[PDB]
Amino acid sequence: HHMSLKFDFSNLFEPNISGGLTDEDVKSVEEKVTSAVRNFVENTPDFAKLDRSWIDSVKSLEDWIINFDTVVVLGIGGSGLGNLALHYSLRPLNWNEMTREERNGYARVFVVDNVDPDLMSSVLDRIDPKTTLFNVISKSGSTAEVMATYSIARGILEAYGLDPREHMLITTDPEKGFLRKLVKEEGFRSLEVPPGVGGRFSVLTPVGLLSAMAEGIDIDELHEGAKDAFEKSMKENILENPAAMIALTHYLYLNKGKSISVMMAYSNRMIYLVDWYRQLWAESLGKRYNLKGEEVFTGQTPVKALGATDQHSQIQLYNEGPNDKVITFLRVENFDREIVIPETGRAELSYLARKKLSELLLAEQTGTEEALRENNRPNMRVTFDGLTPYNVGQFFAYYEAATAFMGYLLEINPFDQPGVELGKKITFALMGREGYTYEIKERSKKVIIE
Amino acid sequence: HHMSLKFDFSNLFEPNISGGLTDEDVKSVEEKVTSAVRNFVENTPDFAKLDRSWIDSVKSLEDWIINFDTVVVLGIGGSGLGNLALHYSLRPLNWNEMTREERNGYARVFVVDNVDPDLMSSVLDRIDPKTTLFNVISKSGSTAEVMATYSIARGILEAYGLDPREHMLITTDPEKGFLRKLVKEEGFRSLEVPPGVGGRFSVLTPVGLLSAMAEGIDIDELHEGAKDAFEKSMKENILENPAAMIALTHYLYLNKGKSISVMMAYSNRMIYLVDWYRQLWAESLGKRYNLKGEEVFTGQTPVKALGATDQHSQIQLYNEGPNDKVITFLRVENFDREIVIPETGRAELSYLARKKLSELLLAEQTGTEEALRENNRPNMRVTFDGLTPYNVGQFFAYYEAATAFMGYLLEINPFDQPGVELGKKITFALMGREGYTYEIKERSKKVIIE
Amino acid sequence: HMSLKFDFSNLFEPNISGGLTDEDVKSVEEKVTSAVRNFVENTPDFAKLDRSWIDSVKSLEDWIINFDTVVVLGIGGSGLGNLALHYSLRPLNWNEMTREERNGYARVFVVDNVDPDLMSSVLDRIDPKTTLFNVISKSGSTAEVMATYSIARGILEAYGLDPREHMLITTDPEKGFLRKLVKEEGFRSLEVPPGVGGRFSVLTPVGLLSAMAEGIDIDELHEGAKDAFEKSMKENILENPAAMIALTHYLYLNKGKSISVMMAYSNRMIYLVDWYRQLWAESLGKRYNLKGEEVFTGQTPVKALGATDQHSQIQLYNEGPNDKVITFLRVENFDREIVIPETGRAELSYLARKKLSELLLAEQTGTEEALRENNRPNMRVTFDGLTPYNVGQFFAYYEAATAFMGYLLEINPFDQPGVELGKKITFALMGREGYTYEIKERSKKVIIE
Amino acid sequence: HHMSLKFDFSNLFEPNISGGLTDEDVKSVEEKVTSAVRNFVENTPDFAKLDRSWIDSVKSLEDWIINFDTVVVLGIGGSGLGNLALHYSLRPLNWNEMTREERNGYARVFVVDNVDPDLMSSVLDRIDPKTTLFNVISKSGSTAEVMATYSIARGILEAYGLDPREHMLITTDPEKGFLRKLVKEEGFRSLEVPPGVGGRFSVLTPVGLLSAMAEGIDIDELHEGAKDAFEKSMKENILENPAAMIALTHYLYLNKGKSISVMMAYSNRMIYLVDWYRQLWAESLGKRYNLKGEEVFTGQTPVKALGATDQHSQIQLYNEGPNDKVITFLRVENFDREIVIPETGRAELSYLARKKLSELLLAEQTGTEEALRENNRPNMRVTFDGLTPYNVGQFFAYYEAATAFMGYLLEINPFDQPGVELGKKITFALMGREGYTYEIKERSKKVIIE
Numbered sequence A, B, D: 001h002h003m004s005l006k007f008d009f010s011n012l013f014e015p016n017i018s019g020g021l022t023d024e025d026v027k028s029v030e031e032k033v034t035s036a037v038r039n040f041v042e043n044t045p046d047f048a049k050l051d052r053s054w055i056d057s058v059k060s061l062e063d064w065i066i067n068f069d070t071v072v073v074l075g076i077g078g079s080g081l082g083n084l085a086l087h088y089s090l091r092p093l094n095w096n097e098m099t100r101e102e103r104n105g106y107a108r109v110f111v112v113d114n115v116d117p118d119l120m121s122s123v124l125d126r127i128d129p130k131t132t133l134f135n136v137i138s139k140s141g142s143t144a145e146v147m148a149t150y151s152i153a154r155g156i157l158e159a160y161g162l163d164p165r166e167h168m169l170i171t172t173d174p175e176k177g178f179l180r181k182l183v184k185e186e187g188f189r190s191l192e193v194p195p196g197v198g199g200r201f202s203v204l205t206p207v208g209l210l211s212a213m214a215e216g217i218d219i220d221e222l223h224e225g226a227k228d229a230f231e232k233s234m235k236e237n238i239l240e241n242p243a244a245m246i247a248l249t250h251y252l253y254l255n256k257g258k259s260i261s262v263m264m265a266y267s268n269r270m271i272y273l274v275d276w277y278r279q280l281w282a283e284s285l286g287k288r289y290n291l292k293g294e295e296v297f298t299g300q301t302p303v304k305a306l307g308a309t310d311q312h313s314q315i316q317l318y319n320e321g322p323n324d325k326v327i328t329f330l331r332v333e334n335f336d337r338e339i340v341i342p343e344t345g346r347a348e349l350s351y352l353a354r355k356k357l358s359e360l361l362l363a364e365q366t367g368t369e370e371a372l373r374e375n376n377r378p379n380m381r382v383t384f385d386g387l388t389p390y391n392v393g394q395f396f397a398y399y400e401a402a403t404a405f406m407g408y409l410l411e412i413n414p415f416d417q418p419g420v421e422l423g424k425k426i427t428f429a430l431m432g433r434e435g436y437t438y439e440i441k442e443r444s445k446k447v448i449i450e
Numbered sequence C: 001h002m003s004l005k006f007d008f009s010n011l012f013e014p015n016i017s018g019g020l021t022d023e024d025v026k027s028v029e030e031k032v033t034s035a036v037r038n039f040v041e042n043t044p045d046f047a048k049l050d051r052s053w054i055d056s057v058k059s060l061e062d063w064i065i066n067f068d069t070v071v072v073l074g075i076g077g078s079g080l081g082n083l084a085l086h087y088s089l090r091p092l093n094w095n096e097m098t099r100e101e102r103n104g105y106a107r108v109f110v111v112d113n114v115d116p117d118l119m120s121s122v123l124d125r126i127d128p129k130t131t132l133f134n135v136i137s138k139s140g141s142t143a144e145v146m147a148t149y150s151i152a153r154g155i156l157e158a159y160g161l162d163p164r165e166h167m168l169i170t171t172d173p174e175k176g177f178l179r180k181l182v183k184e185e186g187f188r189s190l191e192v193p194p195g196v197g198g199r200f201s202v203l204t205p206v207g208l209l210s211a212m213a214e215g216i217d218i219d220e221l222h223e224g225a226k227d228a229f230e231k232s233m234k235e236n237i238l239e240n241p242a243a244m245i246a247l248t249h250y251l252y253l254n255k256g257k258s259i260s261v262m263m264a265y266s267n268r269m270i271y272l273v274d275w276y277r278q279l280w281a282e283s284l285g286k287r288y289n290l291k292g293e294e295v296f297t298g299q300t301p302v303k304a305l306g307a308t309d310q311h312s313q314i315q316l317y318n319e320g321p322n323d324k325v326i327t328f329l330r331v332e333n334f335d336r337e338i339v340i341p342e343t344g345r346a347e348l349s350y351l352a353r354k355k356l357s358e359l360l361l362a363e364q365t366g367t368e369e370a371l372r373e374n375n376r377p378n379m380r381v382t383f384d385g386l387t388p389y390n391v392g393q394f395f396a397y398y399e400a401a402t403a404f405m406g407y408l409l410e411i412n413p414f415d416q417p418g419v420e421l422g423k424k425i426t427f428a429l430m431g432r433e434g435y436t437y438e439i440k441e442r443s444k445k446v447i448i449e
């Protein structure tokens, strides 16, 4: 009883929407898409290989991890969102507020992926350092945010007379960077960010799997789902290849003025899956220069929505504003807690009486999707039979491959992020970091209301 | 020691950005903007009046509310996001996980603004019904989601033999709708959604103020901030009028291809302020037809970002992708818990040693803003001296007025939401609701991978 | 409110063979009377009990209720007083009681060492969010207090707590590093009075703050101290306990009693004995007299606990060298009077249905009599109960007595020059700027590993 | 891993101190010392034999002892201090205030070694009789203080309807005395105080081992250290024999007017090791008569000091008062919780910044030792590499041997205590005990102030 995600691309096509994609459209790109799949098969990126050592190196720590009642991940972006996505999608929303008995002995997971002291302080107020493991995660080994939060955690351990080696696990490049040097000099336990895997493609590497295993997620089943997804993503038959289809259809639509991808998840536990997609799409495909060095300023802005909530926020705009969005719905059909709506005795509420609350949620997704179709707003749907590691591993793999394919189609490098470097340089200079000299000039025009 | 929000619109203008707005641009719209302000002054919408009864009717319940240790708001969109925005921005992030003593006797606030049973179940698992008040909030008195969650809460009270009148407070239109009838027939305590105030403009009405007061927020100071903001928003001098300036500059940019507003808050506690803005902007300004009945499909998609987090997700795209965004930063300069980064003894981290963690966060905002300027991406900044009710009330008022002004400039009705009605009709039909007959047709083209 | 009772009888002939005589008393009476008169005429600051000591501490009462725990970072004079007050005037499980059982008053922990097992164990028991650190140092730079201060402050900083909300500084009003910190950073503060040395400072804000925090009646503490200091100014030596303690101990020191044993018959009084230890040792253990002559004077104070140390030291006190004067502290009424149950066993009939304290008191009486019979000089200080009035009497009488002994021995009882060399060596070991002492390689090394 | 205690006797000798012991001094007593060691080897006292049955009898109760969460030792002196020495030195100071989980399942240990009702009542307020074992320990089987506390514990058990045999374990002489009778008549579990081992020499017998095993101390390792130390104590080469050297040097100094031994431990955890030593030295060596029946009134008063604390209490007197003391330091070089002193940013505290707090403690021991040397105060040092049962067993063994050797040198019986009997007789008479008739006479001279 493991099932493939189901994809329904029907509302992306004519005649389902007037303005839809056509058989001519598909034919216009089919060859370039098949070539993207072939290139993935022939020059497979490291992320798709799902090395056994990724699971094995994490399982090797399992006996040690059961010493801890909490794991705090000190990581950001690629080293933080995948942790939150796994945590939300694959444990109950009140996991960290459950007793240890309710958690069946597994650990609470907190992720500190910002340098806001209100965030760090609120996590620190919830943990006992004597029973906490900090997983310090940075590929580079020197991400400023992670250094700052590492410093705070280390300082607290020191002040309490706790051995940092008993409370910190370092996940970083096997050879380069400051955190790796710390490992080598001080003898920390460690895990690797694989050299050929970039942050935003690292969730199924030890980056994501350690905290997942800590909280009792079946990480083997997670890889089983991703494996099956990657295998379907290598099919040169595009009508059997969900990742190729996502790329094909989004590539075409980007070309036809759809500058926004909306991913709308009909589940509060899926919301961090959408944030993970946000970074994956935006950072991969949002590129100034193409592979030839030509200025292209390409990209499709990823927008996060939550159903049914955002029907009362964004659905007016999605139906009646500019037609610049392709909307992907994430639909889960079975819930771990199926609340039944009681009979209140009021005739006004008979349409709700003794139905599952999820029946209403699912009726809302269906109605929202249909209204959008009727208003010729292109949409597709990914359906999960439940929130299981198998299904979440599929999700990650399919979107990692699709993003890879879109970078091929757009003839850009989907695996770099040059646009982030300037802000960092300015910031380090502001922080007085040795060798950082950028000076922000005094402005001519100052338009302030103070 | 109450201070106005500071606005810096400088990076929206030439020469600060090449491509920026010009004095010619401002002159092109100045008159229409002054007229929007005059119209607001002369035909003031009910939301801007800040009726004393909004605070007084809530304070009248204060003695009763201190019976409860938890308030659960059963509301959605306009009746839910303002509650979450107040809760996050004006209490510590671990408020609901603090002891009652730590909360100084004030209540926990949970908001159930979805029909996902994983959400409702997780809140139900955290509360004792004997010490909980459900605030059921719907302007119409019949929002499906709110009916469903009301039914569940009522059913639990009944099964436990608790009197619903002792555990439910109804906030709805004073005269129309099912919830008002329930009030009248069964004798519930109640509060009003003011007839002339729409959901998305209702946060400073009893909709938002009840839960705020419950958790110990100074609701008087909240209105004091909003009052001062509304007064500045009635200034016909546009260079002294932050709301007029936001409208002026966003109107111009929408016209020049900036189809996205990004609001990027450098605070985890401000994140629900951004979601409140999301609904306010999208639902107000995302309109098919103008006031003349002409098809305009207007709108500017609001995008939520969090700094520094989203520097590792979206900043590549914001600097290097299409130039279709105006970015507003929210910057708070003082934090309730100022963590100091310890000295680790490592020369590599000297740039962080013994600085406030917030110094790094603030350096990151400044650097991110400068990089964007250098890449000619238009941006402005709203600076809060701290997270206080005064400053949050200002924020709400300024953006409510600015949205009002943009609807004038765009010559649409910013106070309706016709585009939501079709999805609801389809959903009710799917739910078998009497008199709802929409039938979804079988599709010609079915493109599925299953 | 009743006066401590003193019974000096077993210090005198014929009660002990070898005891003090009327001739002995006459030999020093005039010098003692002059000690008293000097105290009356040039009263040391500690004996003035300034109103501002209580008033400055009471000013913080409203603020202190924010905290469930006060941690005293202080050592010696700035630490033992707090412990003496804590143990003697609250039940032994006070810090392990619930807040309700404590009637809302705070837990008190004293970190008076730089052992990380001590600091760590206290930190493991506290919530920084509800903890006040009282950082106490007269000089403002005591190394041990700087070290513990640094740790507490670092924890406060890492958690984002404002140090001014969680630290109270007790130091000289004008001089020193801690006073500078107060003035530069705006900490709340209390004073160590300029003319009061650490070991004489328990009844100043040094001790009064943590005592108040835990709900001790500090007014009653001063009321007892006041009454005791009044009796200590009586020129009739037979009405003046402090003068009699100095008289008799001065005579015995001169007759080869090189040890004072203070043996308290109460586990709660044990830190009163430690406070006394520092007071007698550091005051009267002096190389030079007031003329600059080498005298190497001193009487080693020894801490004992009754009835416990009957099974540790009583063999030695009765059968070893006759070099000790033994002062008993006897408390006659206990806050929890446990009654020994009837077991039904004939062998235990002598215990059946008596107060456990009756056994304790019979043990003090028997121990005292056996020592008299063995001609070992002893006296007894009897408390009707462990109350602030009684404890304030105790501190005052002993502070006055130590002042008088310094007069009789013609030394300065208010300095401590012998501590400075070790500190200089230590700072040099710690690499402190301007400390250069180098410990030389030894000729003779006698090691077993 | 297991290391011998290191002894440094250097500052006991000339030229290290002027006035120090000389090679002539050593020659003066070498032969009598060698003869002490030989007597020990040839007529070994029962305490040094470390019978396997002392560990086995205690280990046979381990399954039963895990029923309890708390062991309360009712014993005094020899039957009480050893338990406290082991508890403090080999468990953290907050052991009894740790949760059961923090204690890894092992029991809390309270020792009630006084008939102060404030002691007993404070212990009783902390225990649940249903989960408590009272270990009632008296070699004689009739120690009054143990009878009284036994009576209290038993009465409580009775009045609650708990079976005393499920909550009391009796440790007493195998054949003689009231407690042994109780065992035989009522069927209590029991352990033996070995007939040839006196109380003050009983810590490593079941007297001490039971409570130690209950709190998780490795009692095998305790014996392994004691065994190695007793072996070194049987070496006729006095320069390889620590116990011989302690006895040699202290005997010489006692004869040169050092009437006081100061043991000053630089650890709050070692303070009860010092108290154990106090009873050992005082009760053994403080004798009126020698073995010939000649009046000697011999003895060296043992004084307890704690470093660094007592540098602010006693160090003035030790350096500047009578030169009547030999001072032994106990120095522990590694701590279980190694607190690092943070950097405060203050120039005044740069000599502390980022050093271990124990570096300061150790520097204080060294400086204190050197200043005492400079002032010609004889001192030695015992260095522990950590607080481990191996090191603590070594300590007890070496000091028990040393005391035996001192009694030989002093030609006294180190194994009796006739000076305690008079006080007991008087007390029993005051308590109205049948056959005790002592009458305290009215005094001639009464010198009282009331």
Ligand SMILES: [Cl-]
Pocket (backbone or CB within 6 Å): A302, A303, A304, B302, B303, B304
């Ligand atoms: Cl968004």
Ligand SMILES: [Cl-]
Pocket (backbone or CB within 6 Å): C062, C063
């Ligand atoms: Cl105040």
Ligand SMILES: [Cl-]
Pocket (backbone or CB within 6 Å): D188, D189, D190
């Ligand atoms: Cl048995």
Ligand SMILES: [Cl-]
Pocket (backbone or CB within 6 Å): C301, C302, C303, D302, D303, D304
């Ligand atoms: Cl002592």
